[PDB]
Design a protein around this nucleic acid. Structure first.
Ligand code: MG
Ligand code: MG
Ligand code: MG
Ligand code: MG
Ligand code: MG
Ligand code: MG
Ligand code: MG
Ligand code: MG
Ligand code: MG
Ligand code: MG
Ligand code: MG
Ligand code: MG
Ligand code: MG
Ligand code: MG
Ligand code: MG
Ligand code: MG
Ligand code: MG
Ligand code: MG
Ligand code: MG
Ligand code: MG
Ligand code: MG
Ligand code: MG
Ligand code: MG
Ligand code: MG
Ligand code: MG
Ligand code: MG
Ligand code: MG
Ligand code: MG
Ligand code: MG
Ligand code: MG
Ligand code: MG
Ligand code: MG
Ligand code: MG
Ligand code: MG
Ligand code: MG
Ligand code: MG
Ligand code: MG
Ligand code: MG
Ligand code: MG
Ligand code: MG
Ligand code: MG
Ligand code: MG
Ligand code: MG
Ligand code: MG
Ligand code: MG
Ligand code: MG
Ligand code: MG
Ligand code: MG
Ligand code: MG
Ligand code: MG
Ligand code: MG
Ligand code: MG
Ligand code: MG
Ligand code: MG
Ligand code: MG
Ligand code: MG
Ligand code: MG
Ligand code: MG
Ligand code: MG
Ligand code: MG
Ligand code: MG
Ligand code: MG
Ligand code: MG
Ligand code: MG
Ligand code: MG
Ligand code: MG
Ligand code: MG
Ligand code: MG
Ligand code: MG
Ligand code: MG
Ligand code: MG
Ligand code: MG
Ligand code: MG
Ligand code: MG
Ligand code: MG
Ligand code: MG
Ligand code: MG
Ligand code: MG
Ligand code: MG
Ligand code: MG
Ligand code: MG
Ligand code: MG
Ligand code: MG
Ligand code: MG
Ligand code: MG
Ligand code: MG
Ligand code: MG
Ligand code: MG
Ligand code: MG
Ligand code: MG
Ligand code: MG
Ligand code: MG
Ligand code: MG
Ligand code: MG
Ligand code: MG
Ligand code: MG
Ligand code: MG
Ligand code: MG
Ligand code: MG
Ligand code: MG
Ligand code: MG
Ligand code: MG
Ligand code: MG
Ligand code: MG
Ligand code: MG
Ligand code: MG
Ligand code: MG
Ligand code: MG
Ligand code: MG
Ligand code: MG
Ligand code: MG
Ligand code: MG
Ligand code: MG
Ligand code: MG
Ligand code: MG
Ligand code: MG
Ligand code: MG
Ligand code: MG
Ligand code: MG
Ligand code: MG
Ligand code: MG
Ligand code: MG
Ligand code: MG
Ligand code: MG
Ligand code: MG
Ligand code: MG
Ligand code: MG
Ligand code: MG
Ligand code: MG
Ligand code: MG
Ligand code: MG
Ligand code: MG
Ligand code: MG
Ligand code: MG
Ligand code: MG
Ligand code: MG
Ligand code: MG
Ligand code: MG
Ligand code: MG
Ligand code: MG
Ligand code: MG
Ligand code: MG
Ligand code: MG
Ligand code: MG
Ligand code: MG
Ligand code: MG
Ligand code: MG
Ligand code: MG
Ligand code: MG
Ligand code: MG
Ligand code: MG
Ligand code: MG
Ligand code: MG
Ligand code: MG
Ligand code: MG
Ligand code: MG
Ligand code: MG
Ligand code: MG
Ligand code: MG
Ligand code: MG
Ligand code: MG
Ligand code: MG
Ligand code: MG
Ligand code: MG
Ligand code: MG
Ligand code: MG
Ligand code: MG
Ligand code: MG
Ligand code: MG
Ligand code: MG
Ligand code: MG
Ligand code: MG
Ligand code: MG
Ligand code: MG
Ligand code: MG
Ligand code: MG
Ligand code: MG
Ligand code: MG
Ligand code: MG
Ligand code: MG
Ligand code: MG
Ligand code: MG
Ligand code: MG
Ligand code: MG
Ligand code: MG
Ligand code: MG
Ligand code: MG
Ligand code: MG
Ligand code: MG
Ligand code: MG
Ligand code: MG
Ligand code: MG
Ligand code: MG
Lengths: 272, 47
RNA sequence: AGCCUACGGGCAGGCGCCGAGGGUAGGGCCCGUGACUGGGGCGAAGUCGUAACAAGGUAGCUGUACCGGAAGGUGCGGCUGGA
RNA sequence: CGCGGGGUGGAGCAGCCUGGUAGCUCGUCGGGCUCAUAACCCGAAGGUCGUCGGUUCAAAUCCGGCCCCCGCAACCA
RNA sequence: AAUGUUCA
RNA sequence: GAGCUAGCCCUGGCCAGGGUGAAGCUGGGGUGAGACCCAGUGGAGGCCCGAACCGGUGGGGGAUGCAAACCCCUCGGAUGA
RNA sequence: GAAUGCCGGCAUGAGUAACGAUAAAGAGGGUGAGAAUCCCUCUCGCCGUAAGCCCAAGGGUUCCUACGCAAUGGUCGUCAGCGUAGGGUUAGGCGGGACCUAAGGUGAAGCCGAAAGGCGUAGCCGAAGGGCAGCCGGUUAAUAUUCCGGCCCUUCCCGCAGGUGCGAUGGGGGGACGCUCUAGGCUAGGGGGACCGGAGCCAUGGACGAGCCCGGCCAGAAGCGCAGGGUGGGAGGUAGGCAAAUCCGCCUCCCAACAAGCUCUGCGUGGUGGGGAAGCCCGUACGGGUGACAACCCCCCGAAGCCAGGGAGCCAAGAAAAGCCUCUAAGCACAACCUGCGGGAACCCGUACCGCAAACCGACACAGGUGGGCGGGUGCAAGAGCACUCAGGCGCGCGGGAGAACCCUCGCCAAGGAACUCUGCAAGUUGGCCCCGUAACUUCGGGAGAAGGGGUGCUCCCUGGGGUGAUGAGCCCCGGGGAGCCGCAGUGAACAGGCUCUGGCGACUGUUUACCAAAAACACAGCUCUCUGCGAACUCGUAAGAGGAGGUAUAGGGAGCGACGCUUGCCCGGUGCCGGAAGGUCAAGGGGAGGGGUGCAAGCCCCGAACCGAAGCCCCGGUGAACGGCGGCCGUAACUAUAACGGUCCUAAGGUAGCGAAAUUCCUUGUCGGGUAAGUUCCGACCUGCACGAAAAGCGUAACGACCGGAGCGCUGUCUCGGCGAGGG
RNA sequence: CGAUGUCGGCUCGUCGCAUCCUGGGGCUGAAGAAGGUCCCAAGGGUUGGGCUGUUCGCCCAUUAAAGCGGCACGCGAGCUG
């Protein structure tokens, strides 16, 4: 239900806004254990590391429950679907029968007023978390942990999802969103189902102002610089790079792989 | 137009203050040299 | 401010609305013409190739899509106006 | 004017570097196949090597001088 | 495994 | 040495006055149900004209100047990067 | 005797330029030795969303008063922001600190680093932010929300009096938050008034009249009244709020669903306190007295301000901690906490003055720059614009003459209107509001203020809506209709688009070379390639560590192209990148065939070939939205001409689509056609592209542009071709 | 080279003659007019536009003529850029 605008002014006929119908009447956030002061910054102690960062609207970091093994066997009731400006996906407010209030990365199809649980039993239903060794092979899963007892770290973006291909001893083969086949331990929890907000890929920023609102500064091309500032820079009008394309630091940016060859995690990867 | 000197008691006392000099070896050597030379004002006068 | 034959009237005259036409400006239809360009019809004996009619020597035709000096070729699907 | 590459049968290319013998394709001529042409098959002719010289016993081949053709360069104020 | 100028 | 300047961080402030009338709502129309069409309502946008404000397009003057970047006329933006 | 030598002094230009905005001065009197320049008075000119008031930064004696003018003041100066001396800045309520946290800084624990030192959860510091109890008048020459007067508050400490289990830096709530648009009632502010209060006035032809002119408020506890914000109330169970709670949270019933009720603001009213014009008389450098027993009332407009944490829409999703309430634990229930009343205690710093400027920043009394609040009245539709003008403040610290050239700024002009010139550069036309009326084209929004027009003042009469008013008079907004008057001219002055046609480039709003370039350059949404499995890739750092990111392939880094429509062809021979457990080579190392130097000797010391030896290179493949490249010579068609066609050489392949004398074309003002009287420019075509061409993108495209080129219309001193006048020199 | 500002235009001229015109003259294949060529002569005059930065040049309408050249390819302490 992607929202479109009329061409009453330029940069609007193409501007696109995501559908906010899934967001229930819960515009304000929660507290006691919820958004904390988010320290916005574009650099480390001193100089800038990640270039072209800054500006952007002010935000509050919604603390999410990535390690859902803290309340094993305890049910929960989905009471709301909120907006998180720090993530591409939607968050969900949970009210455990136990008494706590934590946010889970709202998966796709998860509606308000639904029971959810995490643990060994944990019936196979959208939103439930189980160890990978318990989930049936061929089911879509998200929020997978890399190593056990380290929190959810894989397939947690808008619309992303992983699939179980098979088991091997204490490890299970997972088809990550990038198509890479990975061996993940069986004790790593993972929330079954997709993530949702698949329309996030169809959104169109429209104008540069929307990019500035998101905190993305105008990226300057290397060819539009000087040789002191970039390897492609310099030369007379529109030089065709005159050399293999490279980054401002020298390393090439066209097919040059940069993964550490001698890595202990190499014997766990099967695909690209 | 706007010139380079825009007085500020706060900035002047924090950037050229006596405590700031003692915090770094550079400022310490600055005070050392000024003492050796016999300066009447080892640090900028701030009221 | 005039003239009158019956004058709380008329005439001449003055002002106003409309008003043919002229001017200004901008649209709509049609007609002629225009360097150049597109394909078309016709034109006894010009060049290149063989597409089709006999399984025309790759069955032919067709809608579409792409490519090719050119007929045309190929892909997808359809037809018997073929076996 | 300058720099470097080429002038070879009728057409297009080698052969030059390391001198002795000029080959490839097309084309032309004669004869085959066809009813006739093309295609194809069998034989053969065809070259003052741009020219003027000199080095050698000897020059397409090596060295000079001119006649053409091809490309590059002709900037600074 | 191509082709057969024009009219009768 | 970032009391100028460039960028970023935290915290505050400012932007007179006019227009254009997007979405959405309500009613009516339409259909088997819709799409959709009319009004009325509604006030969106790096929207429009134009002050404060931020600039610096073209001309003139200034040239041991008012000024080691100025003054006059004109000009761009002016709820947004 | 020279070095554009150094330091100092004095010459020249020279009594020349200038004397710092063209807002403006004139006169009488006084002081004084000396007044254009100091003081007073009268006339005149200027500002007035300021050139007027109030804070903040900065400045530091500049403020007041007395006595002075050698120097500072662009002249004088009796004057001063200058010298000498004296005086002057009063706080529990204003601001900051004995309160809080943010960026950030620091930093016990801890980590890192040759040393210096770097990082770092807790805590600490860290302020126009949070929290927090004062309003109105009088006084000095100089201080006031500080002193005084009135009224009203806040902390503590000690007591009594009544209640409750009190009780923590601990748990919970709360504090607490975006942008835009708005509702109801108020208040600030302002307009009017036949009502009220006033010293006075009849001028010059008329006016004793609802005549003229001035003024008709401020604050104010409880108690009221009017708006408005917050807030559901009980009974059970509970595993969570890192110990425990009656508190919070989660379930299950019963009543509210409402502001009904509790508190909490704002505003009127209120015991009472204060102020009170214009004019005249005075002596000031200025204020005093009277005016006064002042009166202190009624309408209308009305905020951007208040009730505030109000409401609604939207996406980009909008600080923390303390104060505050509540809950319980240690310990203690002789303690303690809440309320009322008494008595008592309440510190440290600033307070003068300038403060859009002569006191700050610019070496200067510099036409420059400098944050926040108030910023009135009338009219022009509106308004912080414009013109004039309250309050208030100035005439800019050299003047007096004259009426040349010439210069700046400004006005007007016969006839012609771009003939000027690189170009209509400049200047001129137009110009606001209301109503008609608007084309090709298009992304259906636009283009559109298209273009081109008409009305615009004043008077009289008739008539329709509202708002405050009781369904009414008035008062304030909006209209409509008909008669008439004047002038050359009715947004009668000031503020206020010239317009169209057609190309190049760029999609567009934006950004940049402060101090010569604002663009076709950069950026931009969007497309594509590539890398990156999370201790990610990349980046800063020797490291620790941090950013990425408290993000996870719809995410993040790099690169190119730059909306959008249609597209983006061939070559992997070379370079790069990617994939290849084969093979060649390949250093340290293993390894010892064999040899050497010394010893009488065991020995010790050297070299040292086979063979095993990674990366890398060679080798084998892929990959162009990777770096790059994408032919030559001949002949041919039944008029010529050209070549659909063929031959041959080479290459890795031999530029297709779409454009083309173009931001690209040397020859070149190529050749035709159009605009013109005439056109090296411009526009449309031809194609012979020296030397376009497909993401250093190609061909187009509505809209957009202080970009660049051409044309036309309207208009004009640009010009023929000058002339006159105004002010500043 | 411890500086001689270099194109073109505007303003201001001035000079040379081997003269565009006007004045005088001689031949002519000069009947006359109108021409051709040559000699003497500069006193004076030698237009306005379109294109281009132009000098130059090509056109438009004329003219008695629409001359050539020097003066730092005259002239920027005169201007334009
Ligand atoms: Mg809390
Ligand atoms: Mg830090
Ligand atoms: Mg630091
Ligand atoms: Mg870019
Ligand atoms: Mg550059
Ligand atoms: Mg640098
Ligand atoms: Mg650098
Ligand atoms: Mg480089
Ligand atoms: Mg450069
Ligand atoms: Mg180039
Ligand atoms: Mg380059
Ligand atoms: Mg009668
Ligand atoms: Mg056939
Ligand atoms: Mg067939
Ligand atoms: Mg066939
Ligand atoms: Mg094919
Ligand atoms: Mg088929
Ligand atoms: Mg050859
Ligand atoms: Mg050869
Ligand atoms: Mg034969
Ligand atoms: Mg040079
Ligand atoms: Mg050079
Ligand atoms: Mg044939
Ligand atoms: Mg700064
Ligand atoms: Mg700063
Ligand atoms: Mg508005
Ligand atoms: Mg509507
Ligand atoms: Mg609006
Ligand atoms: Mg705007
Ligand atoms: Mg605009
Ligand atoms: Mg504007
Ligand atoms: Mg303001
Ligand atoms: Mg500024
Ligand atoms: Mg700028
Ligand atoms: Mg300017
Ligand atoms: Mg410009
Ligand atoms: Mg200028
Ligand atoms: Mg000058
Ligand atoms: Mg404009
Ligand atoms: Mg604007
Ligand atoms: Mg000497
Ligand atoms: Mg000397
Ligand atoms: Mg000198
Ligand atoms: Mg000298
Ligand atoms: Mg002298
Ligand atoms: Mg004199
Ligand atoms: Mg002189
Ligand atoms: Mg003089
Ligand atoms: Mg003078
Ligand atoms: Mg002055
Ligand atoms: Mg006297
Ligand atoms: Mg301050
Ligand atoms: Mg101060
Ligand atoms: Mg003093
Ligand atoms: Mg004084
Ligand atoms: Mg005195
Ligand atoms: Mg003096
Ligand atoms: Mg003295
Ligand atoms: Mg003096
Ligand atoms: Mg001075
Ligand atoms: Mg005296
Ligand atoms: Mg003094
Ligand atoms: Mg104390
Ligand atoms: Mg504090
Ligand atoms: Mg604290
Ligand atoms: Mg603190
Ligand atoms: Mg901190
Ligand atoms: Mg140490
Ligand atoms: Mg540190
Ligand atoms: Mg810290
Ligand atoms: Mg403190
Ligand atoms: Mg504070
Ligand atoms: Mg505060
Ligand atoms: Mg206070
Ligand atoms: Mg005072
Ligand atoms: Mg007071
Ligand atoms: Mg008091
Ligand atoms: Mg208690
Ligand atoms: Mg307490
Ligand atoms: Mg009032
Ligand atoms: Mg009144
Ligand atoms: Mg009265
Ligand atoms: Mg009288
Ligand atoms: Mg009041
Ligand atoms: Mg309850
Ligand atoms: Mg507990
Ligand atoms: Mg209610
Ligand atoms: Mg009151
Ligand atoms: Mg009250
Ligand atoms: Mg009084
Ligand atoms: Mg008085
Ligand atoms: Mg609200
Ligand atoms: Mg909090
Ligand atoms: Mg604390
Ligand atoms: Mg409370
Ligand atoms: Mg103390
Ligand atoms: Mg004071
Ligand atoms: Mg004060
Ligand atoms: Mg101010
Ligand atoms: Mg000043
Ligand atoms: Mg100053
Ligand atoms: Mg000073
Ligand atoms: Mg000073
Ligand atoms: Mg002055
Ligand atoms: Mg100014
Ligand atoms: Mg300002
Ligand atoms: Mg106002
Ligand atoms: Mg006003
Ligand atoms: Mg009027
Ligand atoms: Mg008004
Ligand atoms: Mg107006
Ligand atoms: Mg205001
Ligand atoms: Mg004004
Ligand atoms: Mg006054
Ligand atoms: Mg005239
Ligand atoms: Mg006239
Ligand atoms: Mg005209
Ligand atoms: Mg002209
Ligand atoms: Mg013209
Ligand atoms: Mg001319
Ligand atoms: Mg021109
Ligand atoms: Mg032009
Ligand atoms: Mg102009
Ligand atoms: Mg006018
Ligand atoms: Mg238009
Ligand atoms: Mg147009
Ligand atoms: Mg329209
Ligand atoms: Mg109009
Ligand atoms: Mg009138
Ligand atoms: Mg009212
Ligand atoms: Mg009413
Ligand atoms: Mg009229
Ligand atoms: Mg106007
Ligand atoms: Mg144009
Ligand atoms: Mg062009
Ligand atoms: Mg642009
Ligand atoms: Mg384009
Ligand atoms: Mg722009
Ligand atoms: Mg610049
Ligand atoms: Mg510069
Ligand atoms: Mg400029
Ligand atoms: Mg610009
Ligand atoms: Mg695109
Ligand atoms: Mg660093
Ligand atoms: Mg490093
Ligand atoms: Mg990190
Ligand atoms: Mg992070
Ligand atoms: Mg990416
Ligand atoms: Mg990216
Ligand atoms: Mg580009
Ligand atoms: Mg299109
Ligand atoms: Mg390509
Ligand atoms: Mg290749
Ligand atoms: Mg390769
Ligand atoms: Mg290969
Ligand atoms: Mg490799
Ligand atoms: Mg070895
Ligand atoms: Mg060894
Ligand atoms: Mg190897
Ligand atoms: Mg022929
Ligand atoms: Mg061929
Ligand atoms: Mg091709
Ligand atoms: Mg062409
Ligand atoms: Mg070209
Ligand atoms: Mg023509
Ligand atoms: Mg032409
Ligand atoms: Mg053309
Ligand atoms: Mg190109
Ligand atoms: Mg390319
Ligand atoms: Mg482009
Ligand atoms: Mg194009
Ligand atoms: Mg266009
Ligand atoms: Mg522009
Ligand atoms: Mg355009
Ligand atoms: Mg003139
Ligand atoms: Mg004159
Ligand atoms: Mg004058
Ligand atoms: Mg020189
Ligand atoms: Mg010299
Ligand atoms: Mg002569
Ligand atoms: Mg003659
Ligand atoms: Mg004669
Ligand atoms: Mg004759
Ligand atoms: Mg003669
Ligand atoms: Mg020349
Ligand atoms: Mg001459
Ligand atoms: Mg010359
Ligand atoms: Mg010259
Ligand atoms: Mg000059
Ligand atoms: Mg010049
Ligand atoms: Mg000179
Ligand atoms: Mg130039
Ligand atoms: Mg210029």
């Amino acid at each position: 239900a992607v929202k479109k605008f009329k061409p009453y002014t330029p940069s609007r006929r193409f501007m696109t806004v995501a559908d906010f119908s899934e967001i229930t009447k819960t515009e304000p956030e929660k507290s006691l254990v919820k958004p904390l002061k988010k320290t916005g910054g574009r650099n480390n102690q001193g100089r800038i590391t990640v270039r072209f960062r800054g500006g952007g609207h002010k935000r509050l970091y919604r603390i999410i429950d990535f390690k859902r093994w803290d309340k094993v066997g305890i049910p929960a009731k989905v009471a709301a679907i909120e907006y998180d400006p720090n993530r591409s996906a939607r968050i969900a407010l949970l009210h455990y029968v136990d008494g706590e209030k934590r946010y889970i990365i709202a998966p796709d199809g998860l509606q308000v007023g639904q029971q959810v649980v995490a643990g060994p039993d944990a019936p196979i239903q959208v939103g439930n978390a189980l160890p990978l060794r318990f989930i049936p092979v061929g089911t879509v899963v998200h929020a997978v942990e890399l190593e056990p007892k380290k929190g959810a770290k894989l397939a947690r973006a808008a619309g992303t999802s992983a699939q179980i291909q098979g088991r091997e001893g204490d490890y299970v083969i997972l088809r990550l969103p990038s198509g890479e086949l990975r061996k993940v331990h069986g004790e790593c929890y993972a929330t079954v189902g997709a993530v949702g907000n698949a329309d996030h890929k169809n959104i169109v920023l429209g104008k540069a102002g929307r990019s500035r609102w998101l905190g993305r500064r105008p990226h300057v091309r290397g060819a539009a610089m000087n040789p002191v500032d970039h390897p492609h820079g310099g030369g007379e009008g529109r030089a065709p790079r005159g050399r293999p394309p490279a980054s401002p630091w020298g390393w090439q940016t066209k097919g040059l792989k940069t993964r550490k060859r001698r890595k202990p995690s190499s014997r766990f990867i099967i695909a690209r | 137009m706007k010139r380079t000197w825009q007085p500020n008691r706060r900035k002047r006392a924090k950037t050229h203050g006596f405590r700031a000099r003692m915090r770094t070896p550079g400022g310490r050597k600055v005070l050392k040299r000024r003492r050796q030379k016999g300066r009447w004002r080892l640090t900028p006068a701030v009221r």
